[PDB]
Structure 1
Amino acid sequence: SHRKYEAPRHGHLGFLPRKRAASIRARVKAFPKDDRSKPVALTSFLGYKAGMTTIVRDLDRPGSKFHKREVVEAVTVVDTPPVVVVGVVGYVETPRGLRSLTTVWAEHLSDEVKRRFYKNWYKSKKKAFTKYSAKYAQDGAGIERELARIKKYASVVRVLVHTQIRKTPLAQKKAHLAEIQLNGGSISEKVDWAREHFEKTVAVDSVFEQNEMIDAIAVTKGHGFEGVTHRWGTKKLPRKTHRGLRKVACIGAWHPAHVMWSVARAGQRGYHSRTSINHKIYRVGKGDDEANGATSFDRTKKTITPMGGFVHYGEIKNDFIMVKGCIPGNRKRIVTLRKSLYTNTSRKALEEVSLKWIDTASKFGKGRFQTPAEKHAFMGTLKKD
């Protein structure tokens, strides 16, 4: 018979299965539509999530109660040192989908990228790309031959880039290699752009700008095996329940004589691929610029790193991106930032954001001081000094 009362279903059936992601680096399954009448540029960037903090700004929103008044918002900081271009790839349209035709690599590769090709780097002879480098030892006819093939046949061009993991406070020492699609210009222009940027660095400010909506792609934090109560949010059973109460009481009717796929079950929680869209950039930070955490109103000389450093991450010594709100993934995890797939004009975008203050108090406790100078001025001299 029909259920006594109606209620919405628990959970979303479009995020199935709730299994572990294949790789710790989330895949980019879509790129913005190419506009050939624009200069060649990257469509995404790679970075590492450092932590969160707080900012204060004025609200520019006519018709709102808090119009022209200060608001407090949470932001996420992503450490983004420049990436290095080390190759290009051409794709050909086929009735069976896109197919990669040829890959061309740069003449010299640093040990960061080479570590990605080894599981036992300390024991290896480090022979990777030794014979391939000989293709450059000649005039370069072999390299030029493959570049002409990409120009002649390919319809989609992507560049192989890797992060400079040594510039972060992480201990991995092995770089992350990924493909980024090039938008703008003809196929020949894309190949020429990739060729000139071999062994060069591309900075994050050349990809993104201020007040721009971007998408974050990452793997969420893992929690292992989880019961149905927290994995799916089902109602807890009464206290009187025998054999346990953090369960689903009825998992199916007599017919069909099977457990259905749409019934909540215990299993892995977390470590899934997610794509979150419409995150506004609040600041594009400069690594070599002192007073990263300074605004036109605060005027104090302080970097973006809070006192004591970001918890479990460290200090920010490179360029960074400040993103409004929260982002999937935990600290120290590699994340991919991608441009939007459509032109958003909901007046939530197109708003000019000007920060007034950036919080730099310690996140390791109930921090009270923004800078060491403030602590000394408030407390005076101590026995230690």
Structure 2
Amino acid sequence: LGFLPRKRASRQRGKVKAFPKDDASKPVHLTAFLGYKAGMTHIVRDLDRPGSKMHKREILEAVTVIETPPMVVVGVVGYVETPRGLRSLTTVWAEHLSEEVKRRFYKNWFKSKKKAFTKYAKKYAESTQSINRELERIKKYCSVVRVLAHTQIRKTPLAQKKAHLMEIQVNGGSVADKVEWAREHFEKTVDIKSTFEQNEMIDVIGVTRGKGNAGYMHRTQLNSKIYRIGAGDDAKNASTDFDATEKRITPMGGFVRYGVVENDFVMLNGATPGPVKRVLTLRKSLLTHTSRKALEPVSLKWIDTASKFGHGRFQT
């Protein structure tokens, strides 16, 4: 069938089969968000919509929290279009690296002599002309620019300190515009909240939650309704129009098996494949949907911050 045969995704990150259709007319931006499937909450969204049956009805549905905020944007990777497919013309990151990125590039970072990009960083810093020449070649030859972007696994609260690198292509913008955006975002921390507000239907993807002797299969939640960005660092993660009072998206006393996300989440009204702390692959829709229901935003009135583990109703 479509999803059949069943096969758990070996890669923790939900490698996107496709990406949103880039267009040079649109500003140089991204079309992905590195979620982490933090948890869920009954974010009551008052669906203020005349004609609809659930007019102004608070939709107390699961706001599937997915930790997604500042993710280390290292550099860019060239991608030239070839008669045999899409070939990576080059891969030029920024001079500045991170221990999490180095840990990701290896498997025994502490055991290893931290040689990851040792001379490469020196070449990037000292031989900047060579980096510029390669960048100039990338801008003049590569058809697409895959903006390299790691994660904040070591930065945000997580046992894994291997930054989830993602070759997020520059969604839109010309070759010069994509290079300039990559240069601006060189050695930066791409914030998922900055990329998108997560206040409407999204194209979140990623592996499912490993049940046992299945799950953990790469999926793509089409038209995944996103309630709001669950900023775990901010006390107002679950604070909404009616709830407010600096409510925390995590359950009172910490979410089950995920606690409180050290950074912003991608809390989405509905389901999201993946267990607690399992890295998600939220992204923009490849196609376009001008549906009135999708266009109309459901006003998030209240939310749920109950100490679900235990007294599933004790919000405070």
TM-score by length of 1: 0.77
- The aligned residue for residue 209 of structure 2 is 221
Selected match of 1:161 from 135, 138, 149: 149
Q: Give the alignment's Cα RMSD to 1 decimal.
A: 1.9
Separation in 2 of the partners of 1:270 and 1:190?
37
How far residue 210 of structure 1 moved from its aligned partner, in angstroms, is 5.0
Contact in 1 for aligned 2:40/2:267 (Cα 8 Å): no
Contact in 2 for aligned 1:159/1:180 (Cα 8 Å): yes
- For the residue of structure 1 that corresponds to 2:44, the secondary structure is strand
Selected match of 2:58 from 59, 70, 83: 70
- For the residue of structure 2 that corresponds to 1:283, the secondary structure is coil
Separation in 2 of the partners of 1:55 and 1:274?
24
- The aligned residue for residue 176 of structure 2 is 188
Contact in 2 for aligned 1:221/1:329 (Cα 8 Å): yes
Which residue type is aligned with residue 14 of structure 2? A
Q: Does 1:138 align with 2:126?
A: yes
- For the residue of structure 2 that corresponds to 1:75, the secondary structure is strand
Give structure 2 stretches of 5+ with no counterpart. none
- The aligned residue for residue 366 of structure 1 is 311
- The aligned residue for residue 283 of structure 2 is 338
Separation in 1 of the partners of 2:240 and 2:10?
42
Which residue type is aligned with residue 141 of structure 1? Q
| Cα distance change on mapping 1:102 and 1:184 into 2, 3 Å | same
- The aligned residue for residue 324 of structure 1 is 269
| Cα distance change on mapping 1:301 and 1:29 into 2, 3 Å | closer
- The aligned residue for residue 135 of structure 2 is 147
Render the CA deviation track for 1:37-76: whole Å, top value 9, x for unaligned.
1211111011211111102232233334332333432221
How far residue 288 of structure 1 moved from its aligned partner, in angstroms, is 4.8
- The aligned residue for residue 55 of structure 1 is 43
Q: Which has the higher contact order (CA 8 A, sep 6+)?
A: 2
Selected match of 2:29 from 20, 41, 61: 41
- For the residue of structure 2 that corresponds to 1:277, the secondary structure is coil
Contact in 1 for aligned 2:76/2:91 (Cα 8 Å): yes
Give structure 1 stretches of 5+ with no counterpart. 1-12, 226-268, 372-385
Selected match of 1:100 from 88, 92, 98: 88
How far residue 357 of structure 1 moved from its aligned partner, in angstroms, is 1.2
Paired-residue identity, %: 76
Which residue type is aligned with residue 193 of structure 2? D
| Cα distance change on mapping 1:330 and 1:119 into 2, 3 Å | same
Separation in 1 of the partners of 2:10 and 2:80?
26
- The aligned residue for residue 236 of structure 2 is 291
| Cα distance change on mapping 1:152 and 1:175 into 2, 3 Å | same
Moved more, 309-318 or 15-24: 15-24
Of structures 1 and 2, the larger Rg is shown by 1
How far residue 287 of structure 1 moved from its aligned partner, in angstroms, is 4.8
Selected match of 1:209 from 197, 204, 207: 197
- For the residue of structure 2 that corresponds to 1:47, the secondary structure is coil
- For the residue of structure 2 that corresponds to 1:131, the secondary structure is helix
Contact in 2 for aligned 1:47/1:336 (Cα 8 Å): yes
| Cα distance change on mapping 1:102 and 1:159 into 2, 3 Å | same
Separation in 2 of the partners of 1:273 and 1:69?
33
- The aligned residue for residue 261 of structure 1 is none
Aligned positions, number: 316
Render the CA deviation track for 1:63-108: whole Å, top value 9, x for unaligned.
3433233343222111113011112111111111111111112112
User: Which runs of structure 1 show a deviation greater than 4 angstroms over 4 or more consecutive aligned residues?
Assistant: none
